Design a protein around this ligand. Sequence first.
Ligand SMILES: Nc1nc2c(c(=O)[nH]1)N[C@H]1C(S)=C(S)[C@@H](COP(=O)(O)O)O[C@H]1N2
Ligand SMILES: Nc1nc2c(c(=O)[nH]1)N[C@H]1C(S)=C(S)[C@@H](COP(=O)(O)O)O[C@H]1N2
Ligand SMILES: [Cl-]
Ligand SMILES: [Cl-]
Ligand SMILES: [Mo]
Ligand SMILES: [Mo]
Lengths: 372, 372
Amino acid sequence: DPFAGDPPRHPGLRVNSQKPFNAEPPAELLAERFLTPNELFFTRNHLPVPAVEPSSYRLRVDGPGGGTLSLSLAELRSRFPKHEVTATLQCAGNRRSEMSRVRPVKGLPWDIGAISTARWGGARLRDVLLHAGFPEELQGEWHVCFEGLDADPGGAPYGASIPYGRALSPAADVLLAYEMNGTELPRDHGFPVRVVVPGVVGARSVKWLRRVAVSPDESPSHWQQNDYKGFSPCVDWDTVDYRTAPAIQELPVQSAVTQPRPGAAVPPGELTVKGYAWSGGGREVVRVDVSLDGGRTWKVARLMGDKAPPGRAWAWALWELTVPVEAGTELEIVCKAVDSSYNVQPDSVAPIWNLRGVLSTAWHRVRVSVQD
Amino acid sequence: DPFAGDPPRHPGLRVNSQKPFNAEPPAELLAERFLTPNELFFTRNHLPVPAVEPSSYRLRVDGPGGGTLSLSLAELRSRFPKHEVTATLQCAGNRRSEMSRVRPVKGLPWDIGAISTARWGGARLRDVLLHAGFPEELQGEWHVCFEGLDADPGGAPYGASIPYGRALSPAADVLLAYEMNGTELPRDHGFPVRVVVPGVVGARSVKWLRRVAVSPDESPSHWQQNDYKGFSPCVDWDTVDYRTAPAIQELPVQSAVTQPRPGAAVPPGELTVKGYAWSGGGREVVRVDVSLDGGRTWKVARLMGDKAPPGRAWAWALWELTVPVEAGTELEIVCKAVDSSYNVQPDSVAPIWNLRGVLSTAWHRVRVSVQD
Ligand SMILES: Nc1nc2c(c(=O)[nH]1)N[C@H]1C(S)=C(S)[C@@H](COP(=O)(O)O)O[C@H]1N2
Ligand SMILES: Nc1nc2c(c(=O)[nH]1)N[C@H]1C(S)=C(S)[C@@H](COP(=O)(O)O)O[C@H]1N2
Ligand SMILES: [Cl-]
Ligand SMILES: [Cl-]
Ligand SMILES: [Mo]
Ligand SMILES: [Mo]
């Protein structure tokens, strides 16, 4: 069994796949803390988890002239000044299950918790590439490709790429992280090294990093070319042409209600509604609107968190709104967020439906009842 | 009459205000060409148009140490290498009229044409500031403030600001433009000099530019502080607090149908539906979906234009879709666009309603009938 060596996990996780392991924290704990504990941070694995001997581990980075720089874990820690970045990773498939309600889709049936937040520590990718000899700027459209140590039966490794400008930008905060919430990277989260690409879909933050290469093209890997793309609601498996849509990089504005949970019976008097909101590309969440009547009337929730610099809001905003609720009533709780570029979320899922079940960002609706 | 000196305009414009002059091109011409002719380019004036003697004109730019650089029009043309940028300006109030249908709002009642596109030529703001002695990077949060030569009765000039980083970035393409579609700036469009801020709301592209200043704060002007902001649908004139929302800079994804026009009777057989789509922040439009049945089913339109570099899609994408239409039917034509960060447009206007009638980006719907 290829998965016998996988790490043990926290028992309260909502698991949608055991082999390979894919799980999310319970929604009731998801937004309990700003930084998601390492043991509850959602886990998305395409393959068996690599077992890595730290001292023999080498990160390979190809230089400008075709040479190869080879770095040990000790050297990655000692050569480059450690930088810390608090960033939220959201999977493209977050909230896929709401989409399947409209019309079945193929994919892991995530609820609202394929998102988590951590303070990451590591070398900046930028410094590693400047050390390998690359310039701050290359002419034209270049990409940085990453391969992981995890590989499918045929030997193809998990891989992804990001544009060269993002990799070299001081402000974009791309890390080759070896620490997570103050401790070393857990195995499920990429030990000993993963890429963390703030403001970008989870798929590009390659775990168990074995190689870094600069190329005039995007990663040729199946997951960069033939997956993690958004299509029209009309497209299906027989018509999809992956050349017609760009690989998902930055993600759009998103939010969900984490408390209360669907089907809850809540006591009359006061109700504290809670959730998260986040947007891609370093775009801050500037407002979260909450409705208790199915989206007819709205109130403004309180945003928690502390501001980040402009263009660098990599971490989610937790929100709450305490409201009066009358005995014997039925509530349809809805939330929608607005970002710093005034992007907003769409009313419904059908018009944004797609065959892969990705980019599920229509309003989250939670129906509960108020007891007598 | 303070407006006696205003320039004459093209007679086919859709004028919503004569004094001050505010007008949009006819929707049937709006998307006829990629570059909007200067005579049809929408015009948004808050005040009387300044009459400027070109030779006595001086642009004032305050240096880092409190000194003032003063530039003539000849020097702006000769000192700095001319750069050309094709960019779309969209007013915050575009499509306000659709919002008033839900609940009356105060503001010029724009239809879908408070947007236009031109190739602008001028000095880069960046070069002008480096020439004034500023560094490429200032520590902290700095702004570049612009004042126009147009001033209200009390003597306050039109003014706005953009973040310092945007002004100094080579990629952001901010210009001090003296040319428009190959000719000198028309008076209504800022002669002799205007700022053009690509990917940003029209309000910041200050016309009839008299001054440029760097400040640790945003423009103190009324239009930067107490206008061009987005609020919750619940906010009204008695509750609005302009300190609670950020000034609009980048705009969200937008699109409209320009052909056919509402109420049209179209011949059976084939119908060519046309429109525009654009997104802020240099984010390319990656897809436009079109429905003929009120948003139940969708097809993908053809995008016209030529690609721009990543992060620099400053100009709109014109689209078209030729479709079969059966005699005696009723169509509800709808369009929605998706940008490079997979941001999308919301189904309806009510949930995005606000007191100023700004940020009107819900799906545009056009009802027509097919003859027999
Ligand atoms: N090598 C490796 N990198 C990987 C993956 C993987 O299967 N292999 N999954 C990716 C995707 S789709 C997701 S959403 C994130 C999830 O990171 P997490 O498990 O630490 O939450 O890691 C990405 N990096
Ligand atoms: N000085 C000056 N700058 C100005 C304005 C104005 O009233 N005064 N209007 C602003 C706003 S709200 C808009 S939408 C754009 C419109 O530019 P246009 O008239 O060339 O289309 O210019 C901006 N710049
Ligand atoms: Cl998934
Ligand atoms: Cl307006
Ligand atoms: Mo993912
Ligand atoms: Mo405007």
